[PDB]
Design a protein around this ligand. Structure first.
Ligand SMILES: [Mg+2]
Lengths: 54, 46, 47, 114, 367, 54
RNA sequence: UAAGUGAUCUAGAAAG
RNA sequence: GUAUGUCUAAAUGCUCUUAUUUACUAACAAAAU
């Protein structure tokens, strides 16, 4: 709650660091996980026949 | 590249070797503990 | 496979065996003395 | 003829087991393979002074050493090695051991660490 | 992913046969080859094949008079025959006492048969290893194809025209055989094959190697032994026993003697003593290893014999390295755990007991 | 797009990733690919995923 | 009263 | 990319151990959420 002006800081990280964050736009702690991809993981296997086929 | 030794078996600072050493210690240590307790018990009995 | 002793006799036999085990061990590893009976248990079982 | 060569040519009569046996028979006689101090290339982790001529061989400097097995292992089943080196200027045999208790080395009558 | 990455349906791969193995590489694929070599180190393929052959021979010996077999001759093949995939040769030639009425070329798992087609006095078994791969991983089909090819053309170094081609896909662990059969043979053969697959030493070793390559994985406690749950101490120290003696000429004759498998129930005192005979070790090598396997097999048999009420929970083993084989053999019985121990238990002095020793001495068979 | 008063979907707004962003993505991909002659296939894959997820 | 036809890149060897 | 250079006169069979490697090479490449 005291970390204010955080997004801007994150954005400006680009100029301080060599390899930057590719998720500058969000931030887990203030926003929560804006995506979740376990479903995808589950389904890829299925798509590929099931486990046995693999 | 830089530090060569890092790609050697004999090098102890190599991680695999370290792990192995730890494992050895852990097993041996456990054995000692098992025996140590027994020894203590014996002493107490005495 | 074994001789059929009476209970006392059996006990005696067991004792003798134990003694033999101890003595042999002493002969072998030149240990000074057995500390207790519970220390000798280990010797008996595990070896 | 090319480093990634899949199959080396064998003669038309090459009983592999028999061949192996033969090799073994002619391994005790053999000069190399039946000896200690087999060569190795290594950089020096200790960064130390050659005790004879005080040549300050620094960290990571590359040498063609001799690795030999020390019979007296550490604890039980984790080997330790003598790793011979020569000083650049004077040809004094520096070496060191790899005692893995501290995850590091030990100097062996060659030079001193600093 | 070797069995997809290396595979038969390749566009342009120059199919080199890998060194001292039957593992075709359709083009130079880099790490794969190394891995394969590691797996099949120290002529492993050959060992596997030979081991299988030996097993087959043993089986034949066991069931000689049941199937009317005069003699079971293991042919002195060229060492590379295991890994000559182009040609082949009869490994186990098989003489008949009376004339066999064999079936037509057919598969190992076929319920319907007809034993009125061809007749023969002599037969052969061929063992054909193959490393499988996603496209041609079907083993049975492959074996059939081989049979069609080898048997027919000119001469495929078989003494008889009729025989069988056992085939074991090492990379898929599938097995199948195809060829000619006589009445009562086929089921037995199938059983033997199954047994081999469950536990051949060479195959086990191969499996272990594969696992390693892949990095795949699956005093104080003395009073616990004597609770209401049934257990079995198993010793293997006196299984392979030898006596050494000098002749008058000087030659030290290392004569193998009749051994035992000490299997003691500590609750009831039932010593299930299997007497191993000297005829087991005839013409063998890597002997200690073989003995362990034998012991394991015996244990398995014993377990099978015991009904579900009388079966153990913890089969305790005396030695350290009697675990794995036992485990392999006891995959049929997963409920039965196999336990190691710190105790150097004194069941190696089973031969010190007189009556037992006498019994061991006076045995003319496995008993 | 919605009018807050009446709750009507009064307008549309079509989106397209601006060319600059596309270019950036491409660059990132290139970077991932370049300086990866070694890398454990899996590491590379992970990197790609990260990029793609972003 | 009338949907659902077709377009299918590739493709490995050496040395570094 | 498994470096290199100088240096050169013209006991026999036996078996048993393994679910490993005193293994060696680094020229090749180097990042996170
Ligand atoms: Mg160059």
């Amino acid at each position: 709650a005291y970390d204010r002006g955080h997004r801007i800081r994150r954005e400006f990280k680009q100029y301080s660091l060599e390899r930057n964050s590719p998720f500058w736009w969000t931030n887990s702690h203030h926003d929560g996980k804006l995506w979740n991809l376990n479903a995808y993981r589950t389904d890829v296997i299925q798509a590929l026949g099931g486990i046995e086929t693999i | 590249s830089g530090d060569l030794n890092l790609l050697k078996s004999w090098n102890p600072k190599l991680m695999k070797n370290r792990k192995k050493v730890w494992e050895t210690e852990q097993d041996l240590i456990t054995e000692q503990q098992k025996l140590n307790t027994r020894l203590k018990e014996i002493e107490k009995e005495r | 496979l074994w001789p059929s002793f009476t209970d006392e006799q059996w006990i005696t036999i067991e004792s003798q065996m134990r003694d033999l085990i101890l003595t042999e061990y002493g002969r072998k590893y030149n240990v000074n003395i057995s500390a207790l009976t519970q220390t000798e248990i280990k010797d008996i079982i595990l070896g | 003829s090319e480093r990634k060569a899949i199959n080396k040519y064998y003669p038309p009569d090459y009983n592999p087991l028999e061949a192996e046996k033969l090799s073994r028979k002619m391994a005790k006689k053999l000069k190399t393979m039946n000896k200690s101090h087999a060569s190795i290339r290594l950089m020096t982790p200790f960064s130390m002074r050659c005790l004879e001529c005080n040549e300050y061989i620094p960290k990571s400097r590359k040498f063609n050493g001799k690795k030999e097995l020390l019979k007296e292992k550490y604890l039980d089943s984790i080997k330790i090695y003598r790793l011979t080196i020569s000083c650049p200027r004077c040809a004094n045999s520096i070496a060191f051991r790899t005692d893995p208790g501290n995850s590091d080395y030990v100097m062996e009558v060659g030079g001193v660490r600093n | 992913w070797s069995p997809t990455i290396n595979r038969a349906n390749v566009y342009v791969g120059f199919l080199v046969q890998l060194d001292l193995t039957g593992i075709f590489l359709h083009g130079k694929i880099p790490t794969l080859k190394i891995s394969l070599i590691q797996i099949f180190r120290a002529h492993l393929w050959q060992k596997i094949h030979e081991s299988i052959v030996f097993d087959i021979c043993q089986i034949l010996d066991g069931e000689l008079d049941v199937l009317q077999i005069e003699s079971v001759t293991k042919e002195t093949v060229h060492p590379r025959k295991s890994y000559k995939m182009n040609s082949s040769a009869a490994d186990i030639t098989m003489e008949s006492v009376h004339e066999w009425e064999v079936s037509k070329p057919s598969l190992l798992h076929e319920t319907n048969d007809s034993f009125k087609g061809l007749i023969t006095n002599k037969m052969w078994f061929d063992v054909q290893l193959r490393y499988g791969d996603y496209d041609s991983h079907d083993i049975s089909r492959y074996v059939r194809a081989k049979f069609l090819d080898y048997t027919t053309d000119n001469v495929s170094m078989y003494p008889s025209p009729t025989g069988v081609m056992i085939g074991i896909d090492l990379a898929y662990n599938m097995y199948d055989a195809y060829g000619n059969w006589f009445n009562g043979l086929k089921p037995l053969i199938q059983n033997s094959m199954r047994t081999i697959m469950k536990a051949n030493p060479a195959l086990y070793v191969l499996r272990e190697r594969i696992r390693k390559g892949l990095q795949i994985y699956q005093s104080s406690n003395y009073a616990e032994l004597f609770n209401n749950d049934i257990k079995l101490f198993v010793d293997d120290t006196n299984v392979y026993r030898v006596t050494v003696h000098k002749t008058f000429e000087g030659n030290v004759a290392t004569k193998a003697i009749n051994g035992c498998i000490f299997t003691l129930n500590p609750k009831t005192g039932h010593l299930f003593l299997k007497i191993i005979h000297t005829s087991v070790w005839a013409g063998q090598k890597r002997l200690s290893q073989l003995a362990k396997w034998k012991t394991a097999e015996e244990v398995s048999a014993l377990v099978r014999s015991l009904p579900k009420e009388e079966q153990p929970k913890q089969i305790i083993v005396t030695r350290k390295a009697m675990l794995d084989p036992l485990e392999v053999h006891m995959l049929d019985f997963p409920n039965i755990a196999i336990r190691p121990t710190e105790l150097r238990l004194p069941f190696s002095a089973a031969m010190s007991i007189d009556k037992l020793s006498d019994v061991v001495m006076k045995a003319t068979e496995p008993q | 797009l919605v009018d807050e008063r009446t709750k009507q979907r009064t307008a549309k707004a079509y989106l397209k990733v601006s060319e600059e962003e596309i270019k950036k993505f491409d660059s990132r991909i290139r970077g991932i690919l370049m300086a990866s002659g070694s890398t454990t296939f899996t590491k590379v894959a992970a990197k790609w995923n990260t990029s793609l997820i972003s």
